[PDB]
Amino acid sequence: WQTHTVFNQPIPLNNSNLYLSDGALCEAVTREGAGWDSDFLASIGQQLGTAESLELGRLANVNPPELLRYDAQGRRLDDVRFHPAWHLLMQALCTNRVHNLAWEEDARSGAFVARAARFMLHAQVEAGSLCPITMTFAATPLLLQMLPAPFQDWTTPLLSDRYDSHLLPGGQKRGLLIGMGMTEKQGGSDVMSNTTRAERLEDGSYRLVGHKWFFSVPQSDAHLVLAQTAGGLSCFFVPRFLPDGQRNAIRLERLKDKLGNRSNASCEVEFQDAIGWLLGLEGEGIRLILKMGGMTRFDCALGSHAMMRRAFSLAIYHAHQRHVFGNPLIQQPLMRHVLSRMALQLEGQTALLFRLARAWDRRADAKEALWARLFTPAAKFVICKRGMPFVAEAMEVLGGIGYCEESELPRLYREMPVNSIWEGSGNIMCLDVLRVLNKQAGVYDLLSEAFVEVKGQDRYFDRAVRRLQQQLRKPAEELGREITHQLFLLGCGAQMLKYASPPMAQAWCQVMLDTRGGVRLSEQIQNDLLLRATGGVC
Amino acid sequence: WQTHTVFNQPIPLNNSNLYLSDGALCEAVTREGAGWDSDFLASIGQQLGTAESLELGRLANVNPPELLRYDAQGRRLDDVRFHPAWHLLMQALCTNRVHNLAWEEDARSGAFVARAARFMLHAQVEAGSLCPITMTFAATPLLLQMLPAPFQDWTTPLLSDRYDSHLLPGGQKRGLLIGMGMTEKQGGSDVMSNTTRAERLEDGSYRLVGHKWFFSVPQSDAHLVLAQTAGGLSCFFVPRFLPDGQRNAIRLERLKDKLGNRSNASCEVEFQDAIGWLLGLEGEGIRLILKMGGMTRFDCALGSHAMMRRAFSLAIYHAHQRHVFGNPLIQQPLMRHVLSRMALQLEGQTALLFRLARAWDRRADAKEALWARLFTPAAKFVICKRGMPFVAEAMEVLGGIGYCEESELPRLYREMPVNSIWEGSGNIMCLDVLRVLNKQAGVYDLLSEAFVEVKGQDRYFDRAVRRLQQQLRKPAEELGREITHQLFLLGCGAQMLKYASPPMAQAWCQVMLDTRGGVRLSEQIQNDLLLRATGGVC
Amino acid sequence: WQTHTVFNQPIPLNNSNLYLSDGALCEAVTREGAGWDSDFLASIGQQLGTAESLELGRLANVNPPELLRYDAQGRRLDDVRFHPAWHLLMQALCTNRVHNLAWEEDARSGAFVARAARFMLHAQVEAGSLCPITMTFAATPLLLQMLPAPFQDWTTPLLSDRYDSHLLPGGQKRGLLIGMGMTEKQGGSDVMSNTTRAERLEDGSYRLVGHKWFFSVPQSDAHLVLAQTAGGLSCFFVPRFLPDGQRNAIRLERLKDKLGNRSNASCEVEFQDAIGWLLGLEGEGIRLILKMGGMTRFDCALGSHAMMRRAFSLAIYHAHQRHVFGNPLIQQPLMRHVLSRMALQLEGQTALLFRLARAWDRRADAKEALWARLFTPAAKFVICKRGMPFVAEAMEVLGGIGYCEESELPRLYREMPVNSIWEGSGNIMCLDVLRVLNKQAGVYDLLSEAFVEVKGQDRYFDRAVRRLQQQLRKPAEELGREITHQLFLLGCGAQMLKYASPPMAQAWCQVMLDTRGGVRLSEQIQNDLLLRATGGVC
Ligand SMILES: Cc1cc2nc3c(=O)[nH]c(=O)nc-3n(C[C@H](O)[C@H](O)[C@H](O)COP(=O)(O)OP(=O)(O)OC[C@H]3O[C@@H](n4cnc5c(N)ncnc54)[C@H](O)[C@@H]3O)c2cc1C
Ligand SMILES: Cc1cc2nc3c(=O)[nH]c(=O)nc-3n(C[C@H](O)[C@H](O)[C@H](O)COP(=O)(O)OP(=O)(O)OC[C@H]3O[C@@H](n4cnc5c(N)ncnc54)[C@H](O)[C@@H]3O)c2cc1C
Ligand SMILES: Cc1cc2nc3c(=O)[nH]c(=O)nc-3n(C[C@H](O)[C@H](O)[C@H](O)COP(=O)(O)OP(=O)(O)OC[C@H]3O[C@@H](n4cnc5c(N)ncnc54)[C@H](O)[C@@H]3O)c2cc1C
Ligand SMILES: [Ca+2]
Ligand SMILES: [Ca+2]
Ligand SMILES: [Ca+2]
């Protein structure tokens, strides 16, 4: 009955450990002060790597949410309906405290780093569910700092490990999600162009009339929303339900039909005299949310890195099994070269991101705070931009089967641009880097110290330092991407030189910084890279 | 911001008790020997009536199953993927033993009646999930009677309360489902036209080559399949997995794209030297499955009745709330007339079906067995045919909102024809009734006795008995539907006269049997009918 | 490579002549004064019966319209996007003047009858596209009678044979469609409960604020819309574009997700100070549209009849080819009986509808006008109610293949209830019949004359006349359906007795009016019925 036998078809990667298979991550977690979380990380790495877990990710994306503007009786409903897989993903994210680990009372030293490792494991399985998690993690410290009086009973659920999908006022719920409404049709990068208007009421609250053009996670229990007041652009707490239990006047008009990120609901919304509570002062909306923005930019970089890691893991498991021209694909000199360069890129990214996580963890230290202020937008720019060609290359390793929606690769590929577009996109990251280099007291000293610490170790690194120094003499706005990319590489290189094995740091520096390419990697480096990326080290 | 206020929109029926709201059913359960099950029935009636339960029914139908013929590597898979709601429905059906209550060791007197009541509650929530349940309930006694030796370890899971969706040989599973493969492209009514061929192997098993054109529940652990042998048309046990653990050679070719019944997978399949085990003798396939057929025909009648009951319950809850021309719709004389006639039809159907369930329960008694043999096809014909106009009328009570897929009514309406088409359809039921009346020893005596028992109580009933007697003098095949319908009504009428209150039996007889219509129901009868249909009695 | 041979599978009906195959229709067209249209009818009957034509019907339903509330820039759009098949269907409908043949200057005697025959041919191919056609045909004479001054240039396009899908003010278009906005969330039967409000402006036009809950064909160039004024419920011309070229303020909020009629867009809409022009006087909205309603009710009856005709034609073509138990299915005594009864029902319906079409054609005659006033709602009630069980029976002739969406039968079945629900639904038709019988001068005389004309010809007919006479003594509202059904049958019977062959009229009267059923049809009648239904006569 058959016309052929099927052979030389790799088995797809599943039922693996997402943590234990990543040598660079395991090393970074210990190095950066989160080793106490390693047993937990191995545990969730196993749970998240199962066929069942990966299926929840697939189901949540192929059954995207449905906007319910009205009920069957023609009354306004303004709700969103998700596939059950979505709620199961949210439950595990919250159980694992990806939304608030760092903010717990008695959080231990390294909690920001431990939380980043947890986030990176989840992000490999499914990306859309990270959006509410990212916004809630970033908004929580600000909300706890400024929590308006009628919402004092939100502190307990903000600190829980309990996802709660009930359509109830937040104070009645066991856990909460918080979103961000900034972008308007006339601009997302330039939020001063916002026309949503807030008028102060007798009781000190404000009435808002306007719109937000991309308003993710409409089901959040509140959104922090930018609006204009007499005193300038300001930040408001806009809860889904008012203190009295009535629904607030946020009208969900249309759900975005997106390239990727499809599991996540993003809406176009309008405020019809919605009630908001001013956070901070009138006119300080942009300043107030700077650090909130910093944390979301970090998560963008970490998310793209995580997706690159998953795509790479799929590619290498496939290339190990697939034979071409009589030999394993991973043994073919050109393929082995390409995959080894990919692995080297992920090693550097992991070292940089986790050092950056430690900086955010230790931000009570002014120099750590400054390092995070400078390298966060740099990391978002370079890593998020790299995501697209990196994932395409992984897909090409698999070949035609990597172009079919049955594979994880298309979904990863379709996700990659979102992280690059988020929060003013790549150019805004670079202009922010230039602003910091220009205006921030202490920056040039911080950089010099970091670079002197490793001076003499590598000729390519030292040449790149001199090139950046020259470039910073006249930092033209048109060179913002060149400068940001150079700065990012020097950050990565300094971490590699300090902490990677010497042959690895040497390989990294030559590949990344030796201005003439044509760099061949030694056999031993390629072997070590590919072994480290499949477990080996942990 | 609003253009209007929404008013006079009924709230849709949910969070009600499917059992306690049905006076006729509660009375029938006690009358027919299953009163010991009443507490359980009230419990599951509450569970099944919740918004959450009704949502599982919706989800399983709007997310229909997907046929997986191949995996991503191009190897044959032959599997079906369902929405999780489907599996949750199956779990509750099996927990409630709708597939096997009557067949348990130590099953108590009335178990067939108790099982019918349980089935009727489930059928109101979701219909497609009743297909595997119906086939498994009907096939189980036959399989236990004839179970081939290599499958002796199936007896325990056949008797469990555990749904098991694992892709494993049945002997390794905690519970089992059994299907039926009869229909071929050239005929489903006339199964002797089957061309699927079975050849005897050295070990006594047979190799099958052929097709089945409608093959529901392909995921069943076995199907009973008709095939031709040297000795005539025969019945085979065809398991999904062979005794050695290999998949059997059943190729799933195409999933039907159906009007209704969409939650249930129905496939077109081909046998490529599939292995089957002969049940019974060569050439006795048609005879062997007669009683199996009887049970499935009963479930068809019961299913259509249940859907009619749900549609009626929705219509009356709506008409009680909706106002037209200044008064409740249920108070408008013409609407109240129509709904009262509907209620009266369901009273008769409930009385007949449960008497029939008792007949099947007590089938060790030759007269009970004969009553079931005769009235089962009659009930399937009339009740399944009535389903379509009855549900359309309920939809029209709701008006335009009953035509929208948000309402339960369209799904009920789209389901109704399947039960009428099943197992040779309406004409085959009537030809079977004629065959029984002609050939079956004892029938005319059984009928006479039943009719004499109530003779003198109602003039319309006694006139209808005389009309049937005349008709049976020359029972032409072309009058098969007229005769079947008359017989059905006399069955219903005898139950009403014996057991309904006299004004109710009087109303039933005049409406159903008074050859000139124009029958107006008294105010008291309409009130009692509509109250009984909303709980009152239980 | 094969497991079986496919055989005994009928070829599906296509490439047939929808007109020439229908003996009763061809005879009715000539009888009722539209014989001059017979060549044209045969021509379009051929065109509409092709596989390509039937495919347009399928495509328009499986690719339903999409509501475009906003454009990609977030500006309001309020438009609907259709599959190209929809526009091709509309083009042929308008070329054939199904929307206005009767209203042309110099329309010839019999034009209403010719238009009804044309409508019936189209309705067999696709039903949703008849909605704009029906509303435009019904509204056109009223609009031409009352056309408000700023829209004088609409007269030419209202009278064209040119469908025009351009998004332009009607006065710039080559042809126009008109819709009807009556139903609100609180009621469609009782339109006096409408809360949409119209306020008179300085220039004599009115500003409307409110909603309509089912608002079909939102893309119409205008809708006639009921709204409350100081002077009572009134009818407004509400154009899609104002005289100055601006879009009118009609907000399309949601598209209905329907059981059937899926090719046709039906919206929930809101008026945000939309401009309307009063037709007639304040407070005469209900009266003004009575005749408009009459024409749409006629089209409902004609549409259900047409769908029944298509379903029957499919069933008989199938049963002629399919063999069961060694003989053609159409030769099996019970099946032949059932199909013959079906054919007889269509013969009566065709005779009645076309006599009714002639009444509407000759409505300058007071007695013809009265016949149409009385029999139109009666016909809508009985015929539209019959549609559901009739089409289900056809599906059951085909068997399981008739339950699959590849067949035309499911789409026909899912369409049938809409015609029964339309314009206040079945109960409102019956209450209207009772109102006419009670209040309308001349009615009892008109009926007596009609009945005396055929008195003595058939005993069952004469007995039914006496039964109706008795019933009309005390015409209780609760007997509205019994009375309407009796009246309808007497209408049909009088046409059959006057114009059918005597054996046919005899067969009709006995089957339809002989209060004890068990009526067997002669061999010759069954043969003549089935031959007439496949062409024979034309
Ligand atoms: C899936 C998804 C979900 C989203 N969810 C949210 C949400 O929940 N909340 C929210 O507020 N927003 C959300 N956004 C919107 C997102 O933040 C914006 O798209 C982003 O800030 C860019 O704004 P914009 O699209 O208006 O582009 P613009 O601001 O018009 O920018 C266009 C391009 O110009 C570049 N540019 C801008 N200014 C300069 C300059 N001075 N010099 C050089 N280049 C410049 C930008 O970098 C960008 O590349 C979401 C977006 C997506 C895709
Ligand atoms: C959703 C669905 C699921 C199904 N699942 C299964 C399944 O799991 N297993 C399986 O075996 N089948 C299944 N069936 C097929 C079903 O049993 C058949 O469709 C049914 O038996 C009718 O057979 P048929 O379609 O070949 O019609 P035919 O046998 O061709 O009958 C067509 C019509 O002719 C009538 N007729 C037949 N013989 C006579 C006669 N002698 N005199 C007068 N009238 C006659 C029939 O009553 C019917 O109305 C399924 C069907 C559906 C719709
Ligand atoms: C596909 C579709 C398209 C439609 N398009 C349009 C459109 O374009 N324009 C428009 O105006 N409407 C439209 N309608 C609405 C349609 O006209 C209404 O649904 C219909 O008039 C019934 O009104 P309702 O749904 O409010 O039911 P109700 O008025 O609430 O009636 C419910 C039931 O009660 C019965 N009833 C009402 N009064 C009495 C009484 N006095 N005594 C006894 N019984 C009574 C009715 O007959 C009906 O069976 C559309 C409907 C559908 C399904
Ligand atoms: Ca090698
Ligand atoms: Ca009353
Ligand atoms: Ca014959």
Side-chain angles (χ1 to χ4, degrees), chain A residues 1 3 67 69-76 185 213 252-255 268 270, chain C residues 1 3 67 69-76 185 213 252-255 268 270:
Chain A
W1 303 103
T3 56
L67 183 55
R69 290 185 286 125
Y70 299 92
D71 63 29
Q73 296 77 233
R75 311 199 162 72
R76 199 79 201 175
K185 294 169 185 174
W213 178 221
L252 302 186
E253 280 302 302
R254 188 154 70 145
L255 200 63
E268 298 166 9
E270 302 189 12
Chain C
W1 303 103
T3 56
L67 183 55
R69 290 185 286 125
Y70 299 92
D71 63 29
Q73 296 77 233
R75 311 199 162 72
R76 199 79 201 175
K185 294 169 185 174
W213 178 221
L252 302 186
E253 280 302 302
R254 188 154 70 145
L255 200 63
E268 298 166 9
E270 302 189 12

Coordinates of all heavy atoms in Angstrom, one line a residue, chain A residues 1-3 67 69-76 185 213 252-255 268 270, chain C residues 1-3 67 69-76 185 213 252-255 268 270, unseen atoms left out:
Chain A
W1 N 0.8 -1.2 0.0 CA 0.0 0.0 0.0 C 0.9 1.3 0.0 O 0.3 2.4 -0.2 CB -0.9 0.0 1.2 CG -1.8 -1.2 1.3 CD1 -1.7 -2.3 2.1 CD2 -3.0 -1.4 0.5 NE1 -2.7 -3.2 1.9 CE2 -3.6 -2.7 0.9 CE3 -3.7 -0.7 -0.5 CZ2 -4.7 -3.2 0.4 CZ3 -4.8 -1.2 -1.0 CH2 -5.3 -2.5 -0.6
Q2 N 2.2 1.2 0.2 CA 3.0 2.4 0.4 C 3.8 2.6 -0.9 O 4.1 1.7 -1.6 CB 4.0 2.2 1.5
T3 N 4.1 3.9 -1.2 CA 4.9 4.3 -2.4 C 6.4 4.5 -2.0 O 7.3 4.6 -2.9 CB 4.4 5.5 -3.0 OG1 4.4 6.6 -2.1 CG2 2.9 5.3 -3.5
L67 N -12.8 39.6 20.7 CA -13.4 40.8 21.3 C -14.9 40.7 21.4 O -15.5 40.5 20.4 CB -13.0 42.1 20.5 CG -13.4 43.4 21.1 CD1 -13.0 43.6 22.6 CD2 -13.0 44.5 20.2
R69 N -17.6 43.1 22.3 CA -18.0 44.4 22.5 C -19.4 44.5 23.2 O -19.6 45.3 24.1 CB -18.0 45.2 21.3 CG -16.6 45.5 20.8 CD -16.5 46.4 19.6 NE -17.0 45.6 18.5 CZ -18.0 45.9 17.7 NH1 -18.7 47.1 17.8 NH2 -18.3 45.1 16.7
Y70 N -20.4 43.6 22.7 CA -21.8 43.6 23.2 C -22.1 42.2 23.6 O -21.5 41.2 23.1 CB -22.7 44.0 22.1 CG -22.5 45.5 21.6 CD1 -21.7 45.8 20.5 CD2 -23.1 46.5 22.3 CE1 -21.5 47.1 20.1 CE2 -22.9 47.8 21.9 CZ -22.1 48.1 20.8 OH -21.9 49.4 20.5
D71 N -23.1 42.0 24.4 CA -23.7 40.7 24.7 C -24.8 40.4 23.7 O -25.1 41.2 22.8 CB -24.1 40.6 26.2 CG -25.2 41.6 26.6 OD1 -26.1 42.0 25.7 OD2 -25.3 41.9 27.8
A72 N -25.5 39.3 23.9 CA -26.4 38.8 22.9 C -27.7 39.7 23.0 O -28.6 39.6 22.1 CB -26.8 37.4 23.1
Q73 N -27.9 40.5 24.1 CA -29.0 41.3 24.3 C -28.8 42.7 23.8 O -29.6 43.6 23.9 CB -29.5 41.3 25.7 CG -30.0 39.9 26.3 CD -28.8 39.0 26.6 OE1 -28.8 37.8 26.1 NE2 -27.9 39.5 27.3
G74 N -27.6 43.0 23.2 CA -27.3 44.3 22.7 C -26.8 45.3 23.7 O -26.7 46.5 23.4
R75 N -26.4 44.8 24.9 CA -25.8 45.7 25.9 C -24.3 45.6 25.8 O -23.7 44.6 25.5 CB -26.2 45.4 27.4 CG -27.7 45.3 27.6 CD -28.0 45.5 29.1 NE -29.4 45.8 29.4 CZ -30.4 44.9 29.3 NH1 -30.1 43.6 29.0 NH2 -31.7 45.3 29.6
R76 N -23.7 46.7 26.1 CA -22.2 46.8 26.1 C -21.6 45.8 27.1 O -22.1 45.7 28.2 CB -21.9 48.2 26.5 CG -20.5 48.7 26.1 CD -20.5 49.0 24.6 NE -19.1 48.9 24.3 CZ -18.6 49.1 23.1 NH1 -19.4 49.5 22.1 NH2 -17.3 48.9 22.9
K185 N -3.1 57.7 17.9 CA -3.0 57.5 16.5 C -1.9 58.5 15.9 O -1.3 58.1 14.9 CB -4.4 57.8 15.8 CG -5.4 56.7 16.2 CD -6.8 57.1 15.7 CE -7.8 56.0 16.3 NZ -9.2 56.3 16.1
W213 N -4.4 54.0 20.9 CA -4.4 53.3 19.5 C -3.9 51.9 19.6 O -4.3 51.1 18.7 CB -3.6 54.2 18.6 CG -3.3 53.8 17.2 CD1 -2.1 53.9 16.5 CD2 -4.3 53.4 16.2 NE1 -2.2 53.5 15.2 CE2 -3.5 53.2 15.0 CE3 -5.6 53.1 16.2 CZ2 -4.1 52.8 13.8 CZ3 -6.3 52.7 15.0 CH2 -5.5 52.6 13.8
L252 N -13.9 49.3 24.3 CA -13.0 48.6 23.4 C -13.6 48.6 22.0 O -14.8 48.1 21.9 CB -13.0 47.1 23.9 CG -12.5 47.0 25.3 CD1 -12.3 45.5 25.7 CD2 -11.1 47.7 25.6
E253 N -12.9 49.2 21.1 CA -13.5 49.4 19.7 C -13.1 48.3 18.7 O -13.9 47.9 17.9 CB -13.2 50.8 19.2 CG -14.1 51.8 19.8 CD -15.6 51.5 19.4 OE1 -15.9 51.4 18.2 OE2 -16.4 51.2 20.4
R254 N -11.8 47.9 18.7 CA -11.3 46.9 17.7 C -10.1 46.2 18.2 O -9.3 46.8 18.9 CB -11.0 47.7 16.5 CG -10.6 46.9 15.2 CD -10.9 47.7 14.0 NE -9.9 48.8 13.8 CZ -9.4 49.2 12.7 NH1 -9.9 48.7 11.5 NH2 -8.5 50.1 12.7
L255 N -10.0 44.9 17.9 CA -8.8 44.1 18.3 C -7.8 44.2 17.1 O -8.3 43.9 16.0 CB -9.3 42.7 18.4 CG -8.5 41.8 19.2 CD1 -8.5 42.3 20.7 CD2 -9.4 40.5 19.1
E268 N -7.9 48.8 20.2 CA -8.0 50.3 20.0 C -9.1 50.7 21.0 O -10.2 50.1 20.9 CB -8.4 50.5 18.6 CG -7.3 50.1 17.6 CD -7.8 50.0 16.1 OE1 -8.9 50.5 15.8 OE2 -7.0 49.5 15.3
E270 N -11.4 53.8 23.5 CA -11.8 55.2 23.6 C -12.2 55.4 25.1 O -12.8 54.5 25.7 CB -12.9 55.6 22.6 CG -12.4 55.4 21.2 CD -13.3 56.0 20.1 OE1 -14.2 56.7 20.4 OE2 -13.0 55.6 18.9
Chain C
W1 N -3.7 -0.2 -6.0 CA -3.6 0.9 -5.0 C -5.0 1.2 -4.4 O -5.0 1.9 -3.4 CB -3.1 2.2 -5.8 CG -1.7 2.0 -6.4 CD1 -1.5 1.8 -7.7 CD2 -0.5 2.0 -5.7 NE1 -0.1 1.7 -7.9 CE2 0.5 1.8 -6.7 CE3 -0.1 2.1 -4.4 CZ2 1.9 1.7 -6.4 CZ3 1.2 2.0 -4.1 CH2 2.2 1.9 -5.1
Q2 N -6.1 0.6 -4.9 CA -7.4 0.9 -4.4 C -7.9 -0.2 -3.5 O -7.5 -1.3 -3.6 CB -8.4 1.0 -5.6
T3 N -8.8 0.2 -2.5 CA -9.4 -0.8 -1.6 C -10.8 -1.2 -2.0 O -11.4 -2.1 -1.5 CB -9.5 -0.2 -0.2 OG1 -10.2 1.0 -0.2 CG2 -8.0 0.1 0.3
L67 N -17.7 43.2 8.1 CA -18.0 44.6 8.4 C -16.6 45.4 8.6 O -15.8 44.9 9.4 CB -18.8 44.6 9.8 CG -19.2 46.0 10.3 CD1 -20.0 46.8 9.3 CD2 -19.9 45.8 11.6
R69 N -15.8 48.7 10.1 CA -16.2 49.8 10.9 C -15.2 51.0 10.8 O -15.6 52.1 10.7 CB -16.4 49.5 12.4 CG -17.6 48.5 12.5 CD -17.8 48.3 14.0 NE -16.8 47.3 14.4 CZ -15.9 47.5 15.4 NH1 -16.0 48.6 16.2 NH2 -15.0 46.5 15.7
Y70 N -13.9 50.7 10.8 CA -12.8 51.7 10.7 C -11.9 51.3 9.5 O -11.7 50.1 9.2 CB -12.0 51.7 12.0 CG -12.8 52.1 13.2 CD1 -13.4 51.1 14.0 CD2 -13.0 53.5 13.5 CE1 -14.2 51.5 15.1 CE2 -13.7 53.9 14.6 CZ -14.4 52.9 15.4 OH -15.1 53.3 16.5
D71 N -11.2 52.3 9.0 CA -10.1 52.0 8.1 C -8.7 51.8 8.9 O -8.7 51.8 10.1 CB -9.9 53.1 7.0 CG -9.6 54.5 7.6 OD1 -8.9 54.6 8.7 OD2 -10.0 55.5 7.0
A72 N -7.7 51.6 8.2 CA -6.4 51.2 8.8 C -5.8 52.4 9.6 O -4.8 52.2 10.3 CB -5.4 50.7 7.8
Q73 N -6.3 53.6 9.3 CA -5.8 54.8 10.0 C -6.6 55.2 11.2 O -6.4 56.2 11.8 CB -5.7 56.0 9.0 CG -4.7 55.8 7.8 CD -5.3 54.9 6.7 OE1 -4.6 53.9 6.3 NE2 -6.5 55.2 6.3
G74 N -7.6 54.3 11.5 CA -8.5 54.6 12.7 C -9.6 55.6 12.4 O -10.2 56.0 13.4
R75 N -9.9 55.9 11.2 CA -11.1 56.7 10.9 C -12.3 55.8 10.6 O -12.2 54.7 10.1 CB -10.9 57.7 9.7 CG -9.6 58.6 9.8 CD -9.9 59.8 8.9 NE -8.9 60.9 9.2 CZ -7.6 60.8 8.8 NH1 -7.1 59.8 8.2 NH2 -6.8 61.8 9.2
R76 N -13.5 56.3 11.0 CA -14.7 55.6 10.8 C -14.9 55.4 9.3 O -14.7 56.3 8.5 CB -15.8 56.5 11.3 CG -17.0 55.8 11.6 CD -17.0 55.0 12.9 NE -18.0 54.0 12.7 CZ -18.3 53.1 13.6 NH1 -17.6 53.1 14.8 NH2 -19.2 52.2 13.4
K185 N -34.4 46.6 19.7 CA -34.1 45.6 20.6 C -35.4 45.2 21.5 O -35.5 44.0 21.8 CB -33.0 46.0 21.6 CG -31.7 46.2 20.8 CD -30.6 46.8 21.7 CE -29.3 47.1 20.8 NZ -28.3 47.8 21.5
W213 N -32.1 47.2 15.5 CA -31.4 46.0 16.0 C -31.1 44.9 14.9 O -30.2 44.1 15.1 CB -32.4 45.4 17.0 CG -32.1 44.1 17.7 CD1 -33.0 43.1 18.0 CD2 -30.9 43.7 18.4 NE1 -32.5 42.1 18.8 CE2 -31.2 42.5 19.0 CE3 -29.6 44.3 18.5 CZ2 -30.2 41.8 19.8 CZ3 -28.6 43.6 19.3 CH2 -29.0 42.4 19.9
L252 N -22.5 51.6 11.9 CA -22.7 50.2 11.9 C -21.9 49.6 13.0 O -20.7 49.8 13.1 CB -22.1 49.6 10.6 CG -22.7 50.2 9.3 CD1 -22.2 49.6 8.0 CD2 -24.3 50.1 9.4
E253 N -22.6 49.0 13.9 CA -21.9 48.5 15.2 C -21.5 47.0 15.2 O -20.4 46.6 15.7 CB -22.8 48.8 16.4 CG -22.7 50.2 16.9 CD -21.2 50.5 17.2 OE1 -20.6 49.9 18.1 OE2 -20.6 51.4 16.5
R254 N -22.3 46.1 14.6 CA -22.0 44.7 14.7 C -22.8 44.0 13.5 O -23.9 44.3 13.2 CB -22.5 44.1 16.0 CG -22.1 42.7 16.3 CD -22.0 42.5 17.8 NE -23.3 42.5 18.4 CZ -23.7 41.8 19.4 NH1 -22.8 41.0 20.0 NH2 -25.0 41.8 19.8
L255 N -22.1 43.0 12.9 CA -22.8 42.2 11.9 C -23.4 40.9 12.6 O -22.7 40.3 13.3 CB -21.7 41.8 11.0 CG -22.0 41.3 9.6 CD1 -22.7 42.5 8.9 CD2 -20.6 41.0 9.0
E268 N -26.4 45.6 13.3 CA -27.0 46.4 14.4 C -26.5 47.8 14.2 O -25.2 48.0 14.1 CB -26.5 45.8 15.7 CG -26.9 44.3 15.9 CD -26.2 43.6 17.0 OE1 -25.5 44.2 17.8 OE2 -26.4 42.4 17.2
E270 N -26.8 52.3 14.9 CA -27.2 53.4 15.7 C -27.2 54.7 14.9 O -26.4 54.8 14.0 CB -26.3 53.6 17.0 CG -26.3 52.2 17.8 CD -25.6 52.3 19.2 OE1 -25.3 53.4 19.6 OE2 -25.3 51.2 19.8

